[PDB]
Design a binder for this molecule. Structure first.
Ligand SMILES: O=C1CCCc2cc(O)ccc21
Ligand SMILES: O=C(O)c1ccccc1O
Ligand SMILES: [Cl-]
Ligand SMILES: [Cl-]
Lengths: 1053, 252
């Protein structure tokens, strides 16, 4: 009666059930087993050809093992053929299949990454022991440096040798005014971009002043002394150091004059630390301009600096000591001479996996591209379908060879048959890195079609062949012109432009399709000089019409007056007309530099030209501050994917900044390292990381420790998630602690820097506070002693969540976006307090999240304040819980914080379209600030099923919130408290709308990463509707209200 | 008729109607101008803008202008294809004028679609794990081979030193010396035998893996074209209805 007695016959019940923890796999300490047995047998191969097998402990150093081996070898024959043990080193084959020599004999058996448990004894070849700490490099990298040396490809070899230009330059800037500049690299000043202060910050200062606390130590290394100043906000560290020394050294035994003289001898012996972490104030910015100060002002805190001896600082900086590595056709025939069309011979795909029943026939689709296509897309015939497919036909492309632009690319795809459907795909650069038009035969191993792409061809996809051999390899052949065809010099292109210009000046009275040429003269029409800036203001995703394109192209020379139009102009050039392109090259040559946030568009997939991308990098070189770079560093690392060649300007820009500023370097390493599993970028990012690692100085050794820590945690959780699943928390937690107590973990997980922030040191592990959270992903809650001198002044304990299992990079981006929305709001005076807690992907679905102390999910609020019997939870309990925390005048401020944070997180969320909010993913801190966690999919990715103009409200303010927002009324909809709130939401909504270009562009730049939520520009197009960019701002306000009203049902007009 | 027009709809939802149609397909649509002819050409959408007349050259209406260019190419107006495919969903939806039963069909197809999208997602993970598992198998094979070399070298290494230490002193020790030297050697060589057997056993596993890998791609490719048509039909059924935006969500 329930199911009409209809049987499901296939259904049989002997990871939907327990639906969590998807990404795998990763092998640990020995091949095929995660953690080696505590006691283990290792064959030691001796130089006398004997195998003696020691039983060793898992945790034992090679010093211990050698020492025992050479005791135990005595008992075997041919002992008199051995030297003293000191004349030997251990070698073995590792899991990366390389024979590593083990130089550092303090290393433990579990930490060597052996393939099989065995150790060959040898006298050390390669007499530069020093040099073969390339092992250090390929640890940090996660692939051995020897794997690059045997790459044939000259581009790679050329990258490696030529990139050192950049390293050697950066290392020079460091040892320039040493030791100060070394300190400046290592400890660069953590500083807001603007010295100007928002209105609302200034007004916490009583007429621009701050009480501060400078601290000092005298003898031995114990007692400390405050010196509680009240300086001007905009006074530099040197001035602040004076006043600490003044007050420290005022006396009844010193005259006024005598004091001034004891100040000057002391004043520049010292520099300012931040108590509790390794941050420092080493250059003349206003105190207010350092981030720590400005935080302290907002949080209502008295800053706690420390007076530090420069020599006790310059003590701690070791020398960086850079070393150059071991790796140090007669003018051809110009592309413009070649008198033919392009034709490409498709030959034969080999490895095509298709059901001959299911699929009728298969062919090779093709196209020439430049982001968009410079000719009609063509296929070939549907020949030898499915069973062993082979077409030996020249495809014929209607474009002359000289009209191929520098950044031209072939994009192809094997398809199935309107039954049209892609199997594989792959793209090739028609020009190589040496500017050489491609000729002869090519093997191209193809990529599988990803999730979001239903399209036939995929040209945004990475240029180059798949490294995975066993995949559809479609080989092919390019025309030959008895010569290595090459792309013209700039000199040659300049002339052709200067000519093409003059030639336009004699074209005559009438031209139908004025379109591409002015016919205006030096005087343009005022209605049009208004229509151009009108175009310029529009966002990148408001596509341009052919009228508008031709129009922009005609007035290209006036477009120099309005530099910001450039992105639009460039997309109106016909890249299949070298006449037009050559002219554009001469504009871009001295086009006025533009704001980095506008220039960053020009390094997305829609601007593949080298000259354009150059200009962009030149913009960044001028304007983009070391502050603003490290914000957008994610998008800039991503955007490398769209560079045609290994060696380019963008790479050389970043690599240099990374070696110039150790704080950038830190995140640069991790962001590249993060994506090293992904074979689209493995080689490229590997090569780059090798450069950085080779040139970055001591930090390599620091990174190596952070890297060793993460690997241990990766292993530990991999066991908890496999074979310790279906065990009680009790049993798991017992396993966890047992393991963390072993000396190798104690070694590896204790003295290092948080990758979330290398300013924080991580000291000893407090295992009593380390635990596995209740999630099925088995995340670790880890806790470390802050081993600063002034732990107490900042935080005695540092705790961060390690989570093997989830792809942290969607979160990472939304949190970055929030970071930016906050900044935009605040720096244009209006205070909405977002809390972009720290996130960082360090792997393939492996990462770190910042713990925010003293905060709870609403659900805990309600579980705590919930009366027995369990009938219903009370709406007021949030409010009651919050009242219970903030009592007196403190209350009034806590509701302002709640209200200010709740409006920001309403607008941000609605705009971004993050996952529906509810009690287990919204959090409230004791001081009354609200913030979201676990955002899910960010651009409305559950609209990929159904969807269609849903324009959802993910943060729907239930009663709970509304009560709190209007102090404690009933019928909260009708208070000034809530009127004020609404007007925050409207001012916040419009503020983001005026910067909408940026947000589009940040998303545009992230298309690179294989995030399923960002497969193509239409994904990003949600953010248009939600911001209502096609409408007027007054309509947009009303739109936003309309949206906010219907999700709430009354309140908003 | 100028409201109906067999294609006049009146940005984003244009592109998602122009998604995956052929080279020629078109339709017609903020103080910029009036209507916009969004014509698709080889994976990229071309937008053409529009006293009575509807750039320089006498066409009295919006329907006047598009019938002319359905016959003819657009090169003569602006240098760089025709309006061949006026694509715009009553043809095959079981012609159902039953407003409710078209809504039920939407759910059936949308449950099939969403079923199918998981099958496609599951398999894509198996594929990608299996790539990783395969290349980890391949690297191990090299590791084995390199391991073996070191032992093959080792059994060779002793033959030089051991058979220098048999002949120099044959009487001294003799079958006390050379027995316990031969024991070691016979450990060393059958150990090599075990290793080589271990490698072999991985290669046979690698082929069975590479076979399974082939089978996953095969079935991905057989799921894919159904996932498009099942999707495309759902969007035509869902378009026919909207010819009740909030009523849809429960079926969907
Ligand atoms: O653990 C060490 C090793 C010596 C250098 C050092 C400097 C610090 O500031 C803190 C810790 C440490
Ligand atoms: O697909 C498009 O609409 C498009 C067309 C030309 C250039 C870039 C694009 O994204
Ligand atoms: Cl970060
Ligand atoms: Cl948190």
């Amino acid at each position: 009666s329930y199911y009409h007695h209809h049987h499901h016959h296939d259904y049989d019940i002997p990871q939907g059930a327990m639906g969590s923890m998807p990404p795998r796999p990763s092998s640990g300490e020995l091949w095929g087993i995660h953690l080696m047995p505590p006691r283990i047998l290792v064959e030691c191969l001796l130089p006398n050809g004997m195998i003696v097998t020691l039983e060793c402990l898992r945790e034992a150093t090679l010093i211990t093992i050698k020492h025992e081996l050479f005791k135990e070898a005595r008992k075997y024959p041919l002992h008199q053929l051995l030297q003293d043990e000191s004349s030997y080193i251990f070698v073995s084959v590792t899991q990366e299949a390389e024979r590593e020599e083990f130089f550092d004999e303090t290393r433990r058996l579990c930490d060597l990454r052996l393939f099989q448990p065995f150790l060959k004894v040898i006298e050390p070849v390669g007499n530069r022991e020093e040099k073969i700490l390339n092992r250090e490099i390929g640890f940090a990298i996660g692939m051995p440096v020897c794997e690059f040396d045997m790459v044939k490809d000259p581009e790679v070899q050329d990258f490696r040798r030529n990139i050192l230009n950049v390293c050697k330059e950066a290392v020079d800037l460091r040892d320039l005014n040493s030791p100060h500049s070394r300190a400046m690299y290592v400890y660069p000043p953590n500083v807001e971009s603007s010295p100007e202060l928002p209105k609302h910050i200034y007004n916490k200062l009583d007429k621009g002043q701050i009480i501060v606390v400078i601290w000092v130590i005298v003898s031995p290394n114990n007692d400390k002394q405050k010196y509680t100043l009240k300086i001007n906000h905009d006074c530099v560290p040197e001035q602040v150091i004076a006043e600490a020394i003044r007050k420290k050294t005022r006396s009844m035994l010193l005259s006024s004059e005598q004091l001034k003289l004891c100040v000057l001898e002391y004043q520049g012996k010292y520099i300012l630390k931040v108590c509790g972490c390794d941050e420092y104030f080493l250059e003349k910015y206003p105190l207010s301009q350092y981030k720590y100060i400005r935080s302290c002002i907002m949080l209502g805190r008295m800053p706690n600096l420390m007076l530090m001896a420069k020599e006790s600082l310059y003590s701690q900086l070791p020398m960086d000591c850079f070393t150059m590595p071991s790796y140090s056709e007669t003018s051809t025939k110009s592309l413009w001479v070649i008198n033919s069309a392009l034709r490409i011979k498709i030959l034969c795909a080999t490895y095509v996996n298709v059901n001959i029943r299911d699929i009728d026939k298969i062919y090779v689709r093709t196209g020439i591209y430049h982001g968009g296509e410079p000719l009609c897309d063509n296929v070939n015939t549907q020949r030898v379908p499915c069973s062993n497919p082979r077409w030996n036909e020249w495809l014929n492309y209607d474009i002359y060879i000289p009209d191929l632009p520098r950044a031209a690319r072939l994009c192809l795809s094997i398809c199935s048959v309107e039954e049209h459907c892609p199997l594989a795909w792959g793209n090739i650069n028609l020009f190589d890195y040496t500017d050489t038009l491609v000729s002869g035969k090519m093997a191209l191993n193809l990529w599988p079609v990803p999730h979001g792409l239903e399209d036939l061809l995929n040209p945004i996809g990475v240029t180059g062949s798949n490294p995975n051999k066993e995949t559809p390899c479609l080989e092919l052949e390019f025309d030959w012109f008895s010569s290595v065809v090459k792309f013209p010099d700039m000199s040659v292109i300049e002339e052709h432009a200067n000519w093409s210009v003059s030639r336009e000046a004699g074209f005559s009275y009438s031209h139908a399709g004025l379109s591409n040429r002015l016919a205006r003269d030096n005087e343009l029409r005022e209605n049009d000089k208004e229509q151009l800036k009108a175009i310029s203001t529009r966002d990148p995703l408001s596509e341009i019409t052919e009228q508008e394109k031709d129009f922009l192209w005609s007035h290209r020379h006036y477009c120099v007056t309005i530099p910001e139009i450039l992105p639009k102009l460039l997309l109106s050039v016909k890249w299949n007309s070298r006449d037009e392109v050559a002219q554009m090259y001469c504009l871009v040559k001295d086009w006025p530099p533009i704001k980095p946030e506008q220039a960053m568009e020009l390094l997305d997939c829609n601007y593949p030209d080298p000259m354009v991308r150059g200009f962009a990098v030149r913009c960044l070189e001028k304007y983009l501050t070391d502050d603003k770079l490290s914000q957008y560093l994610i998008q800039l690392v991503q955007v490398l994917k769209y560079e045609q060649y290994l060696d380019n300007l963008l790479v050389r820009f970043l690599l240099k900044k990374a070696l110039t500023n150790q704080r950038i370097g830190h995140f640069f390493f991790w962001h590249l390292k993060s994506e090293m599993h992904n074979k689209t970028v493995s080689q490229r990012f590997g090569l780059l990381l090798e450069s950085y690692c080779r040139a970055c100085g001591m930090y390599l050794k620091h990174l190596n420790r952070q890297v060793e820590a993460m690997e241990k945690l990766i292993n530990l959780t991999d066991i908890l998630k496999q074979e310790k699943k279906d065990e009680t928390q009790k049993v798991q937690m017992k396993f966890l602690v047992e393991q963390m107590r072993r000396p190798d973990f104690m070694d590896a997980l204790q003295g290092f820097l948080s990758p979330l922030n290398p300013a924080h040191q991580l000291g000893n592990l407090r295992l009593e506070e380390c635990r596995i959270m209740s999630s099925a992903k088995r995340p670790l809650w880890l806790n470390w002693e802050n081993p600063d001198i002034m732990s107490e002044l900042l935080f005695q304990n540092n705790e961060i969540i390690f989570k093997n299992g989830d792809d942290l990079r969607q979160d990472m981006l939304t949190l970055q976006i929030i970071r930016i929305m906050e900044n935009i709001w605040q720096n244009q005076g209006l205070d909405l307090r977002m809390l972009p807690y720290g996130c960082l992907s360090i792997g393939d679905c492996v990462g770190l999240i910042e713990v925010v102390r003293n905060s709870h999910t609403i659900m805990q609020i309600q579980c705590k304040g919930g009366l027995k019997g369990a009938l219903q939870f009370n709406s007021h309990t949030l409010h009651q819980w919050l009242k219970d925390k903030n009592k007196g005048e403190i209350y009034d401020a806590a509701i302002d914080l709640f209200t200010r944070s709740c409006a920001g997180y309403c607008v941000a969320t609605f705009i971004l379209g993050i996952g529906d909010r509810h009690n287990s993913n919204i959090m409230v801190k004791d001081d009354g600030q609200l913030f979201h966690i676990d955002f899910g999919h960010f651009l409305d990715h559950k609209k990929k099923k159904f969807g269609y103009k849903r324009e959802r409200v993910p943060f729907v303010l239930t009663q709970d919130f509304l009560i709190v927002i209007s102090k404690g009324a009933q019928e909260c909809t009708k208070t000034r408290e809530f009127e004020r709130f609404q007007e925050m939401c409207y001012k916040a909504y419009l503020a983001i709308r005026q910067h909408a270009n940026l947000f589009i562009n940040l998303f545009s730049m992230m298309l690179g990463s294989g995030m399923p939520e960002l497969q193509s520009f239409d994904d990003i197009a949600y953010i248009r509707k939600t911001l209502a960019l096609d409408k007027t701002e007054q309509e947009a306000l009303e739109y936003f209200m309309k949206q906010m009203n219907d999700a709430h049902h009354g309140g908003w007009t | 008729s100028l409201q109906d027009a067999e294609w006049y709809w009146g940005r984003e939802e244009v592109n998602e109607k122009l998604r995956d149609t052929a080279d020629g397909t078109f339709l017609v649509r903020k103080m910029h101008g009036d209507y916009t002819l969004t014509l698709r050409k080889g994976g990229n959408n071309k937008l053409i803008k529009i006293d009575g007349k509807y750039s320089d050259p006498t066409f009295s209406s919006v329907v006047e202008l598009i019938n002319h260019y359905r016959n003819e190419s657009l090169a003569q107006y602006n240098p760089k294809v025709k309006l061949l495919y006026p694509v715009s969903q009553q043809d095959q939806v079981v012609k159902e004028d039953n407003i409710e039963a078209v809504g039920k069909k939407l759910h059936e197809y949308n449950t099939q679609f969403q079923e199918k999208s998981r099958e496609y997602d599951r398999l894509y993970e198996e594929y990608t794990r299996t790539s990783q598992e395969i290349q980890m198998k391949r690297t191990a094979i090299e590791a084995f081979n390199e391991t073996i070399k070191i032992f093959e070298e080792q059994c060779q290494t002793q033959e030089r030193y051991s058979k220098e230490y048999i002949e120099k002193f044959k009487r001294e020790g003799n079958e006390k010396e050379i027995q316990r030297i031969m024991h070691n050697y016979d450990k060393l060589k059958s150990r090599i035998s075990e290793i080589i057997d271990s490698r072999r056993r991985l290669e046979e596993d690698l082929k069975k893996q590479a076979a399974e890998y082939r089978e996953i791609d095969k079935r991905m490719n057989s799921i894919k074209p159904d996932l498009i048509q099942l999707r495309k039909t759902r969007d035509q059924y869902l378009m026919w209805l909207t010819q009740r935006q909030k009523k849809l969500n429960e079926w969907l």
